[PDB]
Motif scaffolding. Structure first.
Motif, mmCIF file in Angstrom:
data_model
loop_
_atom_site.group_PDB
_atom_site.id
_atom_site.type_symbol
_atom_site.label_atom_id
_atom_site.label_comp_id
_atom_site.label_asym_id
_atom_site.label_seq_id
_atom_site.Cartn_x
_atom_site.Cartn_y
_atom_site.Cartn_z
ATOM 1 N N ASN A 59 0.816 -1.209 0.000
ATOM 2 C CA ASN A 59 0.000 0.000 0.000
ATOM 3 C C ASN A 59 0.851 1.261 0.000
ATOM 4 O OD1 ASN A 59 -1.880 -2.022 2.021
ATOM 5 N ND2 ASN A 59 -2.840 -1.097 0.217
ATOM 6 N N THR A 60 2.042 1.204 0.594
ATOM 7 C CA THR A 60 2.858 2.404 0.727
ATOM 8 C C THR A 60 3.523 2.774 -0.591
ATOM 9 O OG1 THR A 60 4.834 1.190 1.405
ATOM 10 C CG2 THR A 60 3.233 1.750 3.098
ATOM 11 N N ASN A 61 4.006 1.784 -1.334
ATOM 12 C CA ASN A 61 4.570 2.002 -2.659
ATOM 13 C C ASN A 61 4.435 0.707 -3.451
ATOM 14 O OD1 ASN A 61 7.549 3.872 -3.738
ATOM 15 N ND2 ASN A 61 5.694 3.248 -4.831
ATOM 16 N N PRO A 62 3.617 0.682 -4.506
ATOM 17 C CA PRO A 62 3.439 -0.571 -5.251
ATOM 18 C C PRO A 62 4.638 -0.939 -6.105
ATOM 19 C CG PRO A 62 1.510 0.845 -5.436
ATOM 20 C CD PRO A 62 2.615 1.686 -4.888
#
Ligand code: MG
Ligand code: MG
Ligand code: MG
Ligand code: MG
Ligand code: MG
Ligand code: MG
Ligand code: MG
Ligand code: MG
Ligand code: MG
Ligand code: MG
Ligand code: MG
Lengths: 195, 175, 175, 139
Positions: A59-62
């Motif tokens: 969710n934070t960086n795909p």
RNA sequence: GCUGCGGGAUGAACCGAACGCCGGGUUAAGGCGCCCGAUGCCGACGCUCAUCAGACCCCAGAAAAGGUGUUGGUUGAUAUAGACAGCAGGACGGUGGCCAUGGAAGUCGGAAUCCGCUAAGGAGUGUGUAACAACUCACCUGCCGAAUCAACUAGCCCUGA
């Protein structure tokens, strides 16, 4: 040295098991026709599992995190990654030894393709059970390259048809020569010593 | 019982101890199926303790013998009576098996009750074994194996898992 | 002699039993630990010959989950005396290796030689206690083919229990 | 399609097990998986063997249902399965595999030198045949 | 706690088993598709299709209840004195009986319950037209042709989730 494997009528897990076992010994194995690898179960079930796998993402960086390939060659390569110890310098060298290709490359057109018997759909699956094509799954989800790969595949199948007539003509000529005379003197010795 | 491997048929006879209150015990007799004679003796003590006033200390086993098959070369039909205990409650059961010998038929009975009804060997109690003849079989499977001039092929017969080399140009044709 | 008359026959229940200890050391109740200390089974995989008696069988019924005990045959006695025969003078277990050790330390009863020792172990005579005290508990290796689950009795396909003739197969695997 | 099938009175071959290379004859099917097979002259004893353990053949006999060793032997000697079985290409293929197992180094040397000579003759004669094919196609 | 080691992926208590430094062999607990040592046995029997399968004590999730989804089992009842389903025909007379009247003329309700013709009709299983009437069912007969029906029970799977 090098091994060239067919993908037509093979199962994903069985073929990945045999490839991941034989690549740790050093035999440079290459799985060709990877889009033809069958997967047991219903096709809606398999694409539901693959849709859940696509839903698995950071969710934070795909980008920094879960990469999800759509091409079937890279699907099989991720399947062999999840089975080899790729975090150490044994499975990384084994993945460097392994090459995978969708369609058939031009050297692998010429070089003969092996068929593993223990990974076959016919050997492992009851024929009244459902199945799914990895190429059909890849064309449905992401991999937009069936119109090129199928066209080049039909082109090389036409090339194989135009080669097989010449090979069968040469085989008929050499069996006419074997039907002809003055070879039987060595053939008596060959039959009495295991023709 | 473990029912390890094939089973064996044992004739085990037992009696009470010679006591001044009652001499000459009646010397009872059973037909115990077991993998070996030690399990046959112990399961004999189990069944005779459940039937009559007998225990191992106040009794003895007179004889324990292997019972060989009366006709091993004949394909026979055996009806087995079952007192297995399920998860909810115990039940009575009549099963049929077409096999050569009695020990093999009761072996198939234990393996099949372990397969279908998930019954362990702790719960299965063989009540009675009897060879039944033709035209008395209740089961449709054994009734349709009752065929003279029987014809069936072997469709889709695949075999030899990696006895052939793992890498070949072959593609095995079935049948 | 009995089958010609049509009668059954029971043999003599033997008075000698070989006892190997199967289970481990830690996690053992004192009720069975004291009986193992009296049967000289202080380590794992050691064995003793026990003169059977009501008190001895009632000890073995206490230590059923920890030992395997049976009736040794003549080779089962003979190979344990020949191959791993270790006596003790007072301390200091010496391998037998000569009849002079038995004639000096044990031969105060007409039992001076190893044929006498094997005869006294097999046919339990009046001086069995001196021979059993002279023999150190037989250290035995783990068997070749393995063991069956070590926890249930031999009736339930296990190891810790009575088997009465399969200790010959067990001693051919272990010795 | 389905030219072969198990039957009361069909000879069969054994591939796996202790009776490999020995012909059996099916008497009756027990239950779906094992058959009571018997051997009159092929040294195999009357027992129960699995269908996947055996291999189907094409020759049939006329057995009564649950017959004996005597009548199986009489029908075997009436049908003459031994000489007729030797006179096929199947038994020649199995015999060639056994002779390959029974090769030696001197035999392999003779086979290899005759193989070199035959392959040179094949190469030259196939080149002559394709030269003649081009000479035929030239007009 | 004061305790290493092999399994339970990972663990204080679980299962084996307790520890001086090593060589050989064997084994427990566990496992033998790849990580990961070992079934790459021409392993045996049977069950299971999930569009949320399942995968081993503690242990890391789930019930009551239901399924003409398949596999056994029990209890029975029908069927050449031709059943089960299918198609076709009948389904009356006493009597619009009786307690009722806003209706009852089987069909909201209360109590009952027989006879004749009989091939067979239940003083009626429902649908209705408000009721009076049409429709249908138990039952009966024509064709078909030999197995059929019902209620429980427990193994897998599904819903409940
Ligand atoms: Mg413990
Ligand atoms: Mg070994
Ligand atoms: Mg314990
Ligand atoms: Mg302490
Ligand atoms: Mg650990
Ligand atoms: Mg865990
Ligand atoms: Mg070691
Ligand atoms: Mg184990
Ligand atoms: Mg391995
Ligand atoms: Mg159900
Ligand atoms: Mg569920």
């Amino acid at each position: 040295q090098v091994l060239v494997l067919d993908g037509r009528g093979h199962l994903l897990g069985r073929l990945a098991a045999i490839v991941a076992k034989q690549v740790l010994l050093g035999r440079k194995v290459v799985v060709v026709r990877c889009e033809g690898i069958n997967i047991s179960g219903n096709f809606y079930r398999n694409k539901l599992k693959y849709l859940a796998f696509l839903r698995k993402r950071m969710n934070t960086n795909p980008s920094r995190g879960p990469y999800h390939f759509r091409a079937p060659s890279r699907i099989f390569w991720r399947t062999v990654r999840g089975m080899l110890p790729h975090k150490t310098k044994r499975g990384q060298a084994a993945l460097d030894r392994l090459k995978v290709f969708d369609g058939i490359p031009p050297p692998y057109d010429k070089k003969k393709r092996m068929v593993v018997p223990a990974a076959l759909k016919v050997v492992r699956l009851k024929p009244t059970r459902k199945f799914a094509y990895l190429g059909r799954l890849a064309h449905e989800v992401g991999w937009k390259y069936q119109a090129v790969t199928a066209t080049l595949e039909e082109k090389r199948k036409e090339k194989a048809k135009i080669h097989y007539r010449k090979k069968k003509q040469l085989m008929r000529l050499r069996k006419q020569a074997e039907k002809n005379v003055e070879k039987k003197i060595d053939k008596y010795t060959e039959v009495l010593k295991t023709h | 019982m473990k029912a390890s491997g094939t089973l064996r048929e044992y004739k085990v006879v037992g009696r009470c101890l010679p006591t001044p209150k009652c001499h000459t015990p009646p010397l009872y007799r059973m037909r115990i199926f077991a993998p070996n004679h030690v399990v046959a003796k112990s399961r004999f003590w189990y069944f005779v303790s459940q039937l009559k006033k007998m225990k191992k200390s106040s009794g003895e086993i007179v004889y324990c013998g292997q019972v060989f098959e009366k006709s091993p070369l004949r394909v026979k039909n055996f009806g087995i009576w079952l007192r297995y205990d399920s998860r909810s409650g115990t039940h009575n059961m009549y099963r049929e098996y077409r096999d050569l010998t009695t020990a093999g038929a009761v072996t198939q009975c234990y393996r099949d009750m372990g397969a279908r009804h998930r019954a362990r060997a702790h719960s299965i109690q063989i009540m009675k074994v009897e060879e039944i003849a033709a035209s008395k079989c209740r089961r449709p499977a054994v009734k349709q194996f009752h065929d003279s001039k029987i014809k069936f092929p072997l469709p889709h017969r695949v075999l030899r898992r990696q006895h052939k080399p793992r890498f070949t140009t072959k593609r095995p044709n079935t049948f | 002699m009995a089958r010609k008359a049509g009668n059954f026959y029971v043999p003599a229940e033997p008075k000698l039993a070989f006892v190997i200890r199967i289970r481990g050391i830690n996690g053992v109740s004192p009720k069975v630990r004291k009986v193992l200390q009296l049967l000289r089974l202080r380590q794992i995989f050691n064995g003793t010959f026990v003169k059977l008696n009501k008190a001895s069988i009632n000890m073995l019924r206490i230590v059923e989950p920890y030992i395997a005990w049976g009736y040794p045959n003549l080779k089962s006695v003979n190979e344990l005396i020949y191959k791993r025969g270790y006596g003790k003078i007072n301390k200091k277990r010496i391998a037998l290796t000569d009849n002079a050790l038995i004639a000096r330390s044990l031969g105060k009863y007409g039992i001076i030689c190893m044929e006498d020792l094997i005869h006294e172990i097999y046919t339990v005579g009046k001086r069995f206690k001196e021979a059993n005290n002279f023999l150190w508990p037989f250290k035995l290796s783990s068997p070749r083919g393995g063991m069956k689950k070590k926890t249930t009795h031999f009736v339930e396909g296990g190891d810790a229990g009575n088997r009465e003739d399969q200790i010959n197969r067990l001693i051919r695997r272990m010795n | 399609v389905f030219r072969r099938f198990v039957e009361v009175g069909r000879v069969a071959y054994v591939s796996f097990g202790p009776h490999a290379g020995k012909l059996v004859a099916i008497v009756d099917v027990i239950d779906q998986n094992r058959a009571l097979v018997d051997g009159p002259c092929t040294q195999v004893r009357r027992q129960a063997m699995p269908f996947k353990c055996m291999q189907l053949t094409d020759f049939i006999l006329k057995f009564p249902h649950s017959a004996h060793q005597k009548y199986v032997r009489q029908a075997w000697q009436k049908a003459d399965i031994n000489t007729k079985w030797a006179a096929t290409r199947w038994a020649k293929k199995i015999e060639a595999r056994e002779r390959k197992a029974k090769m030696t180094d001197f035999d392999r040397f003779k086979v290899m030198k005759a193989k070199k000579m035959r392959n040179r003759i094949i190469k030259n004669e196939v080149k002559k045949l394709q030269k003649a094919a081009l000479l035929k196609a030239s007009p």
